[PDB]
Amino acid sequence: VEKNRKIVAENLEKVQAEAERLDQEEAQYQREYSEFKRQQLELDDELKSV
């Protein structure tokens, strides 16, 4: 019971570390996608102004 507890504990730790990795990826996505949105929002009004 001690050994297989460490195995599942490590499995949980390894998988949750990946969730944090994809959280860090989304964070950068949000940053990058927001600047694309900001540029698209200015192009939307520039297409209207033209």
């Binding site: 019971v1 507890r5 599942v8 504990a9 949980l12 969730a19 994809l22």
Partner: protein, 49 residues
């Protein structure tokens, strides 16, 4: 007392074992509750991921 001391060493060896049997039992019981908890956490974190 020499006769009672010998038997009373055993009476302590038995009682001492009983305390380790109890503790080790509940240690497994607690060791197995972390199984269902962390394995279920493993599952939910795998579907989530």
């Amino acid at each position: 007392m020499e006769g009672k001391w010998i038997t009373d060493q055993l009476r302590w060896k038995i009682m001492s074992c009983k305390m380790r049997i109890e503790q080790l039992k509940q240690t497994i019981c607690k060791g197995n509750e972390e199984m269902e908890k962390n394995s279920e956490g493993l599952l939910k974190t795998k579907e989530k991921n």
